[PDB]
Ligand binder design. Structure first.
Ligand code: BEF
Ligand SMILES: [Mn+2]
Length: 128
């Protein structure tokens, strides 16, 4: 994928956003922004330029399922890649996010190798 692709990393805890940001840099992506919840996330997406979202699930104000649903229902954002990265691992939640349109789903804790695998799997399916 184009190394200039802009990412938005959403999680309500700094530690996790920091881990994803660093991993993304390893992969060659330095155009990355952070958000602390769904609303904050939507405000930045509004601002424009984003080509990929990586989101947590449990966050105050607007959780990740809602954020995902919001993005898919928005005419100007509906196809935006959204990779869930969460501790939620019950099948019913994986199903709910999958059905809601999630591009991929990663359960915490995750290895560096797993994140790169899932990001590439999504680039592959979208021809990015
Ligand atoms: F808070 Be996330 F769903 F890990
Ligand atoms: Mn959380």
């Amino acid at each position: 994928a184009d190394k200039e692709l802009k990412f938005l990393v959403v999680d309500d805890f700094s530690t996790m956003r920091r881990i994803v940001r660093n991993l993304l840099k390893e992969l060659g992506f330095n155009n990355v922004e952070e958000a602390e919840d769904g609303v904050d996330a939507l405000n930045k997406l509004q601002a424009g330029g984003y080509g990929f979202v990586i989101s947590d699930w449990n966050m105050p104000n607007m959780d990740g399922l809602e954020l995902l649903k919001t993005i898919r229902a928005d005419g100007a954002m509906s196809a935006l890649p959204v990779l869930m990265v969460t501790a939620e691992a019950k099948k019913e939640n994986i199903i709910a996010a999958a059905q809601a349109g999630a591009s991929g789903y990663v359960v915490k804790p995750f290895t560096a190798a797993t994140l790169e695998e899932k990001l590439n799997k999504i680039f592959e399916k979208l021809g990015m």
